[PDB]
Symmetry: D2
Subunit: 380 residues, 4 copies
């Protein structure tokens, strides 16, 4: 992996093998098809069982529930390699691991845990997280118009932009009565999932609109410990962690491609790579990558030692994704005409990162998170 | 049109009505479809006769040759309205007008002028401009390996990323023997035009690769006055002029849509338009637009009074396109998830502007143009 | 003057002569000493009678009043040349002309007007404008704790950072009872003016604090028409107009000194001026200079025709000062070690611009002004 | 320690203590006077023996030579606290430790090491590093016009901007015959050092001009192992290490002061600290500080394990100093009028950092360092 300040020297042998392993895998199995799957706008479902065979699904979870029980650094490292190929592939794992497996493990009943975690871990049953609604996801609580009225519940509302919306059997829905979380099977009557069309970003992924019309759900399917905005938020903190890592991976990809191109093309007689203005762009790309890996690494250790805070996560997601988005654009610029075609990746990552830059908290909401943490004043 | 500094007060009545009519035509005949066409990646050929009828083709040229004989400001103004819909539509007019109609008029023989200009002006025969080659369009003299050997000339070479490549009957090809310019019919044996596929930018336009294999061209088809790099460059200067204008139009498009969206959406209880962080973005968008129109307007007057220099044009193209590209990205950011779909224009303009940001001299070449201007030293 | 888009072509002969004369005067009489004056932190009072002679004091006001009765462009042009030497010299003229002369003229009694305007205009009785208070000048209405209770009015309050505080005989104090405008002689008992020391910025200018303790002022000394926040505010709009002009005077000053240094000094064998990264800083200081003059010029014409709006003024002050400050910083960067010494102006302007970047509305308040104007929503 | 990511957790008890101690003593002996010393532009020589007593002089050097033999992290930590007060105080320690102590230790004879290192360590004899010359410090090999002829050697040439130049007994002079290094006593006939006046940056520090006119130096005073450009460069790498740390310190200082001010001042009825635009600036400052500590930390560990490269150091110096300069400006902006006076530190740090941003390799030379390292091509 790209590593200027040798942070690998700080990884365990276990962490570095999952990295080596994730790369050989994705390099054999996904990378040769990424262009075509993005172009056609389709998510490669024959890869879910493979991710699963490699332990990409809920990696840090306990083997008891079918988890790989590896470190957070390792989870971050698989996200890194996944995103290095395409953010859509990384999105699937994030959702399944931190937005589905995670809440069940953290807030589910022992019944829910034994029942779902193993099938989710083995890519045998796919899930999706429904928090964002049409009035706007930056206000998670304020725009949550999905209701839940109670030994069975009846759900009514809508969710927008839900990843795995049409692939999932299980949908973690968040509604109000007070915020609660339900494990809603997608085939229970009154539940409809419709895919979003005309997507110019994160095409290698399924995004749906969820419509719950008088959907019936037993109390045995409501997350017992799931209480308040804090429950789904903790789920975003988890997801955001992997993303701060993946962002660095897509950055390696556009960077690597940019210097190769810069080095093979020439201009007023030197090589593109010899010009000061192109060198400055690459220098910036390298500097950002190095800064990003350290944030991600540091956050991985704090996470396992139980001292990681959401604001800390907000910082790394905000910074890393912003850098990756900027780097993707700079790379497309460097590629010139050749960069407007899916022949190079730079623009695929550039578009994909526009989404990553938006979901799991926009650049601005994270700014506010940090802002409030710094001043103690709420400016949202 | 968007006009914060009331520059319309500075336009003649004639110029102001080419603006009103252009928007009426495009608005009922092109904007309703631009989505679909960009989406399926097709250029609406049936609109070429409509542009011809409106006098969009080579607007400043003398009525003698079938031109509308209107002002540069008027040309800039039609480019403005064209780009505001889609850069691809503006590209066609730029090519036909400044990269084709212009070369023939400034460097053609009286025979070539009487023969082609009227057909081109009436959108009866479409042309293209072949300057850029596979090794790098930023050094157009240095990477020009297309050769021409002499009462007939045999041309051999390749051109990459040529607009109207597959629509053109006439191809203005630049080769060396010393730079010369030929009016090469596209059906003369040995001439092949293949379209570029997998385009994520400027999809509502045809881009081709030209391959000239032992193409014979009579001396009667070589541009007599066309001598040196200066000939094709003067064409770019003309083209760059209209682009500085169109850039401002696509800016009005994304800006207008952004404030509308900002005003209609809400979170933490006030409109998105009331937040300090989105008002700053809209404010930047407005500032840039005002700055851009003034540059464009100033250049239009200098142009008609014969005092416009290439360096001045480079400044306007560089500044305006950069600003429009930055504004398109800011708008997509403002639209959130809704901006990643072609349901909003923001991202279509965002992608298109990536191309405009590249062709007709990249951001960096213009910087060097200005740099050389300022210091007298060549740093390319 | 520096004029890459030949805007001097848009100037009348009179407006062009006031500019030539202004530069000749300042070059011979102020530039040679600005370094020592800014150093010892003193404002050259002997220059006040000279400004008067040249007609710098209240230039647009009617000759009946001792005014030069020239255009707004001309006022903008003298500001330009003044700032090109030092912001402190321009500040004196803005205060005297737009913050003192103006309100008396716009809202004064006929007695106040015939009395005060000619003396102020021959540089015979120098004024100041006391609006800002210790709690925050961005909320001029909110933070206005100075009281006025009534045929005489007793005033109590404090004013911070008042230019000409210790030079003024007349002090335009703004207070509440609804905002009223006064015109307090500085010698009327209970009125104290203390200079601010340890100033790093705008050292060639006197800044004071005004303490009004039970100050008695006849109603004959109150601005009859000065009603509401709108009155002291319109005075800021006038001043901000010449500031937008002056900013592009100091930018000509830093840009010019830097291209000269860049062409004169040199590294790995070429000159500084020839490296891509120095060329780029200069291109940017040229691009902004051009954008700024057009904004300033356009505003000057709208002003004389009664079409100028405050939001319009907010835009050019905001853009031009930010550009001139970034340009000053970029220039100090270009000068290297040599730029940290007053031997080069770059840093003196860099420090001064910091103040103009703050007074007469900070960068952010102007952003909010534009924001409210665009959305119709107040976000201050 | 401002420490958002709890990096103090990565520090040994010893390192932690050198930090606590450093802050306690500079807090009592330096902070209360810094404002004044900077003002009158004087370096507090009386603090030199104090620094020595705390072990600030050549902290990582072996106790055998009078060194504290502590870690690089610890050296970085003292630099941090020193700069947090003022860059000029940190500069003295950098010069003495990495630009004077270091070269003697790394390239000196056993006689030079035993003779000088203990007196330097005890602040009993102050040194200065003379590399930069009047034609340009960025090309130190190319602009090194100082010559040394041959056992005495006679030196003649001139050096610019040399910190401690007037405070020193020994001057390390780099000259050509190839690059050689000499330990020139400052009282040897033919050597003169006059100060640089009119400094508006790093005023709490002595900067001199060194003039060597036919200066005689024995071969016993030439650094034996000192060969080539590399020798003096290794010295800068060392110095740049501590600076990447110090930068973080001044950042904490302006940041801390900014939020305090933002919290205590209010506007349209909120505190400044509750505005989205001011929160964003602080958020950025906090993000930069967190990124900067990690870079500094990692570099410290790599350094002690003998794995640190110059390019890695270039990255950290360029990034951290640039961020600290940016943050200082963003703080002055936040302070408003109150920020232009030495009452607030913000502007003193802003001015000091302009120097740090320039010496020990400018922002641009570091960019080129990284550039060359990434592409393998030299663009200087
Ligand atoms: C491809 C894709 C996949 C997604 N998958 C999921 C998923 O699986 N699960 C899920 O729950 N959600 C998902 N989302 C939703 C995503 O999290 C939202 O798009 C995100 O919350 C942005 O919110 P919004 O689109 O409703 O826009 P808004 O929240 O309306 O935001 C629009 C613009 O306003 C700005 N803004 C909003 N509030 C403020 C404020 N208070 N102050 C200043 N600025 C503000 C934002 O920064 C943004 O710039 C997905 C989105 C996309 C595009
Ligand atoms: C949609 C589209 C349509 C087009 N249509 C036409 C057309 O109709 N006719 C035509 O002739 N051409 C056309 N082009 C070509 C276009 O002008 C080129 O893409 C442009 O010149 C960029 O050159 P390049 O792609 O060869 O990349 P390069 O020239 O290799 O540039 C690549 C990267 O290097 C940078 N660079 C290059 N030289 C230097 C230097 N000396 N110093 C510092 N940086 C440097 C550039 O800034 C750019 O960032 C079109 C391109 C596109 C994408
Ligand atoms: C050299 C000098 C000369 C001056 N001369 C005069 C004079 O002659 N007459 C006169 O009346 N005044 C004068 N001033 C005052 C000047 O106009 C004020 O400094 C200015 O209003 C800034 O306000 P403040 O210093 O009170 O800081 P504040 O108003 O407290 O502002 C501090 C920081 O907060 C930000 N802020 C404030 N409100 C908001 C908000 N609602 N939303 C987001 N951000 C906000 C500001 O942008 C600024 O960044 C002078 C100042 C200086 C430095
Ligand atoms: C307060 C202070 C203390 C100092 N103390 C010392 C000391 O103790 N010892 C010592 O040896 N030196 C010292 N210096 C010198 C310092 O290292 C130089 O100022 C620095 O090398 C900048 O070089 P210069 O001033 O000669 O400007 P130049 O090298 O001429 O640089 C000027 C501008 O050109 C740019 N530039 C230069 N070369 C290139 C290139 N090839 N490509 C693109 N851009 C380029 C630079 O980036 C800079 O922006 C000190 C300087 C200051 C201001």
């Amino acid at each position: 992996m790209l590593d200027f300040y040798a942070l690998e020297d700080l990884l365990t042998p276990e962490e570095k093998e999952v990295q080596k392993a994730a790369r050989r895998f994705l390099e054999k199995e996904a990378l040769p098809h990424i262009r075509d799957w993005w172009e056609e706008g389709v998510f490669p479902t024959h890869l879910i069982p493979r991710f699963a065979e490699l332990g990409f699904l809920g990696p840090t979870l306990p083997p008891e529930y079918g988890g790989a029980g590896v470190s957070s650094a390792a989870y971050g490292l698989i996200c890194y390699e996944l995103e290095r190929v395409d953010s859509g592939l990384r999105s699937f794992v994030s959702v399944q691991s931190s937005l589905v497996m995670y809440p069940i493990y953290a807030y589910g009943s022992e019944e829910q845990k034994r029942e779902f975690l193993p099938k989710l871990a083995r890519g045998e049953m796919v899930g999706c997280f429904g928090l964002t609604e049409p009035d706007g996801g930056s206000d998670p609580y304020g725009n949550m118009k999905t209701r839940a009225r109670r030994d069975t519940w009846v759900l009514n509302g809508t969710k927008m932009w839900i990843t795995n919306g049409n692939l999932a059997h299980l949908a973690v829905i968040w509604a109000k009565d007070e915020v609660l979380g339900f494990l809603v099977p997608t085939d229970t009557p009154g539940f409809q999932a419709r895919e979003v069309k005309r997507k110019m970003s994160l095409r290698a992924s399924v995004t749906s609109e969820l419509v719950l019309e008088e959907v019936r759900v037993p109390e045995s399917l409501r997350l017992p410990k799931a209480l308040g905005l804090k429950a789904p938020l903790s789920c975003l903190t988890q997801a955001r962690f992997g993303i701060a890592w993946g962002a660095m991976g897509a950055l390696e990809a556009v960077y690597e491609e940019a210097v190769a191109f810069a080095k093979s093309r020439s201009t007023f007689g030197e090589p593109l790579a010899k010009k000061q203005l192109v060198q400055a762009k690459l220098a910036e790309m390298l500097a950002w990558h190095t800064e990003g890996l350290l944030l991600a690494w540091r956050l991985a250790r704090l996470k396992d030692e139980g001292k990681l805070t959401p604001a800390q996560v907000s910082l790394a997601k905000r910074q890393n994704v912003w850098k990756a988005l900027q780097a993707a654009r700079m790379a497309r610029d460097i590629l010139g005409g050749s960069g407007i075609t899916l022949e190079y990746h730079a623009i695929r990552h550039m578009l994909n990162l526009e989404t990553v830059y938006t979901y799991e908290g926009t650049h601005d909401v994270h700014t506010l998170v940090l802002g409030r943490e710094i001043t103690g004043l709420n400016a949202f």
